[PDB]
């Protein structure tokens, strides 16, 4: 899961 703007990965 990649956050739309920040592109931060969240498993």
């Amino acid at each position, epitope marked *: 899961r990649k*956050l739309p*703007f920040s592109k931060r990965e969240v498993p």
Partner: antibody
Amino acid sequence: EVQLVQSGAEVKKPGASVKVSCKASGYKFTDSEMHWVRQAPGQGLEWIGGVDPETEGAAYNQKFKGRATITRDTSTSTAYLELSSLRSEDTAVYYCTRGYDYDYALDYWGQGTLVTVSS
Amino acid sequence: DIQMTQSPSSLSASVGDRVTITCRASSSVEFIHWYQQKPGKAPKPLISATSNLASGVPSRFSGSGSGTDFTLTISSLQPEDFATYYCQQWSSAPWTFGQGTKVEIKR
């Protein structure tokens, strides 16, 4: 169940500021982004900006840069949009919406907050 | 900024008709998302990444396209499909939306 609950409708004078809240529940608030989208008579939908709680910052559409402030309180799972130097063109319904995954549409939206700019 | 242009801006059709809404991006995008907005309500996700139906979306909705040209198809228009449809891109900042397409029902 995911819920995004916004603050009530407001009237503000031109030049004043407005601060709208969006209380989130039913998911891990710090693991998603919160975005602000407005619907003005003149246009369809316009992205204002948003926030990833694990960044201590916020992203803005260049149009709103320097006039909007997007904040978040991780303790109450509340996202806020503050719009300053209000003009007639700012009369609009403001929606908060969850940014869950880049491959998926903004999946949950608040009920909207109508802000009217009038003297 | 990437400008999203929908055509037509409004259409009317009967229940059971096949309806199409195009979305053109001014510059190539990886994909688009579609939203459906009922009057007095917030937009709801309809299609994710050009062709994937959002949660609870009936099979009569489909999305196709690539680069700058995209289509939303409603294979058998139903009364509850009365809404404004919006396309959106977030491949480039600022994120932008189409102007919306109002779908009205002839009966």
